[PDB]
Amino acid sequence: TLTFTNLTYWLINATLPPAMKYPGTDTTITRSDSSGYNRYVYVSYYYDPSTGYNVTRISIVGFTGDPTNYTNVLQLCNKYYSGTLYAKLVAVGTVGTTNYESYIKDFRVYFVNPTTTPNYVQFQGTSVTQSATGSVSIGPGQCATVGAYVLVDPSLPTSARDGKTVIATYQVNVVFSTSP
Template identity: 55%
Template sequence: MARKRRNYKPLTALAIMAIAALVAAAVTFTNVTYWVVNATKPPAMKYPGADTTVAGGNYIKVSYYYDSQNALNITGISVIGFTGDPTNYTNALRLCNYYGYGPITAQLIYRGTVGSTGYERYVKAFYVYFTNPYVQPGAGFIDATTYSQSATVTINPGSCVTVGVYLKIDPNIPMNLANGRTILATYQVDVQFTAQ
């Protein structure tokens, strides 16, 4: 008696489709994590520099405010440049590591103009730097050259570094704008801290 040959092709095709379905299927499982959020002061903070006391604080002021639209604490530094004469404040701001447990690096990042007054063209240089503008690169612009970020500095626990600012104002500015009260430009410079 002859054996009947069985056709396994449909079974093979079905097995291949089942394996493909298993491979394509996603396995979902849940592993619970709890994220506990606490608050403390940041390891590094900004404070007014010593130059804010020169001439009774008439030439440079530091203030703080909260920008609720962007949920950021903003440090505002108002500086007066002298027309036609380069002006250099060497200690406009202090960056201090009072609350950190280890060294922190800091870098200045120039972001550009905030809004417009229409008088920005009279500012020929705005350059912020750590310690010495000629040794350690800063951030901002001098004439047509833009420096997007400074070198980094290390701030050890309990220590501070100073930030200076170099300004140059066009000597041909209209005198009604050179009154010490008219805002010529506002520039954003971020201080980026990195804990080591």
């Protein structure tokens, strides 16, 4: 009864995102042992073909029985957006499974240069114990820095200690915004 339409159009323009990810400084640690991988932090990306995400993988070397605390892994900052951005981290879960996930007794991703409310997402093996952090303000040009933290349970099997076997793959979304 008395229905009518309005017939909208939608036009989509495409551009490069204004946030981007930058490789920090610890990737140039340039010092390593006889294990093949001759670095300690890898920062790189690869276009996922299944769903089209700009996935940026990070490889961190974790030390058995000794907590490890990085400081400069990723740099987040806008190069195009003239206002004041807002950033936050959200945890999701593990990607894949190698059944070694129960040997990661702790794992944290946290802001370094600017700080805020809780300011770290924490994984307890496979589960998640801290979902999201607070927001942080990024202006035009200056960059916030993201560190890392890992503690591998020292009961790790010997064969998986030579620095090759991957023992975890954690999902960490980086959600930007334009309001606090």
